[PDB]
Each structure stands twice: as C-alpha cells, then as structure tokens.
Write a protein that binds this ligand. Structure first.
Ligand SMILES: Nc1ncnc2c1ncn2[C@@H]1O[C@H](COP(=O)(O)OP(=O)(O)O)[C@@H](O)[C@H]1O
Ligand SMILES: [Mg+2]
Ligand code: NA
Ligand code: NA
Ligand code: NA
Ligand code: NA
Length: 287
C-alpha cells in the first residue's frame, strides 16, 4: 500500500481504517469532524485511473445516488480523492443474507435506483463499464440508508465528443470490467455502449433473486463469453416479474449507436412495483 492507518493527508484527513482493497480508507476529516472515504493510488501504478474517477465524480455532483465530492490531490507519491462515506455494499448485503438472495421487493427497489444512477452517468456522457453489486452501497445514516449510491468510476469512459455527439467506436477495445457481469459486447472486445451497462444491471438483478448466475463456477473469460453468446436469456425471466420480458427484449435490441429507452425500462420497474404492492417504506431484507 501507499498509505497506512494513522497518516494524515493534506494536514486534514487522518487515515483510520482500510475499507477496500485499489486502496480506500475510512478517514477522519478534521475540518468537519466527520468520517469520509479516501481513495488513493500510487503515482507509479501503470494503470492510473483516479483522474477519471475525480472527473466523473465532479460531473455527477448534485445528482441523486452519487457521493458528495470532498477533495482531491496529486503528488509525486500518490493521487487521492475524498468523498462521502457510505454504508455496506450490495455484494456484502446479499452475502449477509442466509440464503444469498434478495426478495423481489428489495430487488425491484434496488434495481430501480440503480437504473436511475445508470441513466444519470450516461446523461453526463460517461459509461460506467463495471456495473456490479460491490460498486453500489446503501447510505450509513437514517436519512441516507434507504438510498443506494453508485461507486467506482475508475473504469469509466466518455462515450460523447466535446460537442456531445456519440463518438465513433474503436475497432477493438480492451475488456476492463468484471467477467461475471460483462455483456457479450465486452467479451468480444468491442466498444462498449450504454446498453452494456444495462446488460450488467440485468445480470445483477437476476443474481439478486436467484442467488447465482449460470456461469458462476466458470473462470475462463472466453468460456464465460461463449456461454453468454449462446445463452437463451429468456430463461432468466422465470424468476422476475412478467414485465421484465419487455426489459430484456428492449436491451437485446440495442447496440452501441442506439440510445436506450430509459423511460420504458423505468416503466418496467414502476409497473412491477405497483403490481406487487411494494412501497418504499417496506423493510429491505437486511432490516
Ligand atoms: N464512498 C464509499 N463509501 C463506502 N465504501 C466505499 C466507498 N467507495 C468505495 N467503497 C468500498 O470500497 C470497495 C472498493 O471501492 P471501489 O471504489 O469500488 O474501488 P475498487 O473496486 O477499484 O477497489 C467498494 O466495494 C465498497 O465497499
Ligand atoms: Mg469497485
Ligand atoms: Na480529473
Ligand atoms: Na481530468
Ligand atoms: Na476498453
Ligand atoms: Na444502430
């Protein structure tokens, strides 16, 4: 690691506890007397991504489901960013459930919040490219703990130009994200688009309700991609509310050059939540 518990960054943030390992700490902000999240990277790491992370976090400021930006810096030893500290991430919350699953009520509410966050990052011109449960966390206070926050913009890519139009895709793009949640496009080393973040959301929602994905045990990235390319994704509809056939049909129709119909996808969640009688104040599974 570059830092260690106890050290002070910028005479202000005292590192207290490592919370993620990418080196991230719970730190004391001496100016506000609050615990914050501080993420650091070596100025010698070949893949340096905190520049991207700060730029996207700044672009999302003020929007829902985004940590507040607190500060950032760059020195000869490391780069760092400081942001609002959240609570438990969704991978940990699902694993803390004795059955390894969420109910459809918790799944639909989380999915709708995650969809909102994906529409927000696309609306500022960026793809997330690593949508997965450990990159989402609930708030840690009574006023935030029912809110899900999108994390980890290090692998993001701008898909618009300086003008705001969609940029021409590269012929070949390195696969950056997580094999388990990656779309077919990612596996093919094709330029990822907005629909590929939505495919990762779909896989997350299926894994929430079922507890696993079909390729859970498969570790060869090419084997996983082969399975996904041939898989009949309609089989995943079995444990989701009926309108997710509309969700799957829609994202299947998309490609790099087609903006998603976010209103349609939102309606799938809104309608399912209403049909199941789900209300926001219902306890989440971990309550
Ligand atoms: N603002 C935050 N508040 C709380 N936990 C965070 C925060 N940012 C990241 N984490 C935790 O750290 C883990 C890894 O951080 P993340 O930003 O995803 O970086 P990386 O995946 O590159 O290690 C997350 O899965 C989450 O548990
Ligand atoms: Mg992460
Ligand atoms: Na930046
Ligand atoms: Na920048
Ligand atoms: Na790439
Ligand atoms: Na097209």
């Amino acid at each position: 690691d570059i830092l260690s518990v106890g050290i002070l960054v910028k005479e202000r943030w005292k590192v207290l506890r490592k919370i993620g390992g990418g080196e991230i700490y719970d730190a004391l902000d001496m100016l506000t007397r609050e615990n914050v999240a501080l993420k650091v990277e070596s100025a010698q790491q070949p893949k340096q991504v905190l520049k991207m992370e700060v730029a996207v976090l700044k672009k999302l400021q003020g929007k829902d489901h985004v940590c507040r930006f607190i500060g950032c810096g760059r020195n000869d030893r490391f780069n760092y960013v400081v942001m609002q500290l959240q609570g438990r991430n969704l991978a940990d919350l699902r694993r803390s459930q004795s059955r390894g699953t969420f109910t459809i009520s918790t799944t639909l509410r989380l999915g709708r919040q995650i969809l909102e966050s994906i529409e927000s990052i696309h609306s500022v011109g960026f793809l997330h490219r690593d949508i997965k449960p450990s990159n989402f966390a609930m708030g840690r206070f009574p006023s935030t703990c029912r809110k899900c926050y999108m994390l980890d913009f290090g692998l993001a890519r701008q898909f618009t130009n300086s003008c705001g139009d969609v940029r021409p895709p590269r012929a070949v793009a390195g696969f950056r994200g997580t094999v388990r949640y990656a779309s077919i496009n990612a596996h093919r080393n094709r330029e990822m688009g907005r629909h590929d973040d939505l495919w990762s959301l779909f896989y997350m929602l299926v894994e929430f309700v079922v507890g696993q994905l079909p390729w859970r045990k498969i570790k060869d990235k090419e084997q996983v991609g082969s399975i996904k390319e041939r898989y009949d994704h309609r089989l995943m509809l079995k444990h989701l509310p009926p309108e997710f056939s509309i969700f799957l049909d829609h994202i299947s129709s998309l490609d790099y050059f087609t903006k998603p119909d976010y209103q349609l996808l939102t309606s799938v969640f809104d309608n399912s939540i209403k049909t199941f009688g789900v209300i926001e104040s219902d306890p989440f599974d971990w309550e």
